[PDB]
Amino acid sequence: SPIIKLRNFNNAIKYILIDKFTRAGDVVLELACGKGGDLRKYGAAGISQFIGIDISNASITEALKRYHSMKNLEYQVILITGDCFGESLGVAVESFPECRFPCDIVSCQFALHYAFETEEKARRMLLNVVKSLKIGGYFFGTIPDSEFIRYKMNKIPESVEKPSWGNSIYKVTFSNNEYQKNGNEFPSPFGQMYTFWLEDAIDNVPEYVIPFESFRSLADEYGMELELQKGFNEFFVEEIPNWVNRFSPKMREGLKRSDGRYGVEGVEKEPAAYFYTTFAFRKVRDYQ
């Protein structure tokens, strides 16, 4: 399946990204952890403690069910329902004093753009990140790539009321064309909504652009400086040599293309390799 190949590729991206920044003994806070599908990736990195928070009780229930079916684990796991973006994290974690804060790593996969609903939420998310992180610690994850979004939008005429593009397995549909009416610039970095469909994965969910320059400038205000901004394709090309043989046999065969090399080809290439970017920052100073 194109979708199976996409899932395997993005799973590989996460393995690589987690390993790149997470070191043995680290304490990890995972924001918007969903159903907690990356635990084994953090275990491979040798962490000491994992704290996962998600706003969905149904997702946390599933993550706890997945956790409790694991065995011989060498790290502690805390899984919590709470709002990571609209409220202070202290609300979510107060009844879990076993959390070891500040932590060494904050991660967030396929979710941070929901914090760009408004400026207030973007700032609250960043304040939660930096208050949780030690000086010198890292914040990393995976988001839709505003630069690829802008490329596509720059090819859409102003006559289109709901700018849209896609292929047989994915589709983006913007709520409005204010980008096009405003000289190919969003009227605000925040709240710029589009619905995202990905076959058998994402059911037309509204989400928000995360303009990378605004994310970066806000992060700097809160004391975090840029470490990584490579799109999935470039990231994979650069890192796969060190990993081709680190991956499970099943993940490796899944990554093999028809020409015998590694990556994605075919219809899944655009959504898997171009639509998303990695990000990482380092906390370099305390924020008042």
Ligand SMILES: Nc1nc2c(ncn2[C@@H]2O[C@H](COP(=O)(O)OP(=O)(O)OP(=O)(O)O)[C@@H](O)[C@H]2O)c(=O)[nH]1
């Ligand atoms: N644009 C966008 N894509 C997302 C979002 N969440 C997930 N994705 C995409 O959907 C893929 C995940 O497909 P799933 O079927 O959810 O697989 P999974 O995350 O491995 O499985 P679970 O642990 O059960 O959640 C990701 O690799 C991304 O391509 C999102 O909020 N926005």
Ligand SMILES: Nc1ncnc2c1ncn2[C@@H]1O[C@H](C[C@@H](N)CC[C@H](N)C(=O)O)[C@@H](O)[C@H]1O
């Ligand atoms: N304000 C919020 N605080 C915490 N989690 C949120 C918030 N808004 C959305 N989410 C979660 O963000 C997640 C988005 C998912 N696309 C990604 C989940 C997970 N990281 C994964 O990669 O599978 C969901 O699990 C949502 O419930």
Ligand code: NA
């Ligand atoms: Na972006």
Ligand code: NA
């Ligand atoms: Na819009």
Ligand code: NA
């Ligand atoms: Na936006």
Ligand code: NA
């Ligand atoms: Na986005």
Ligand code: NA
């Ligand atoms: Na920055």
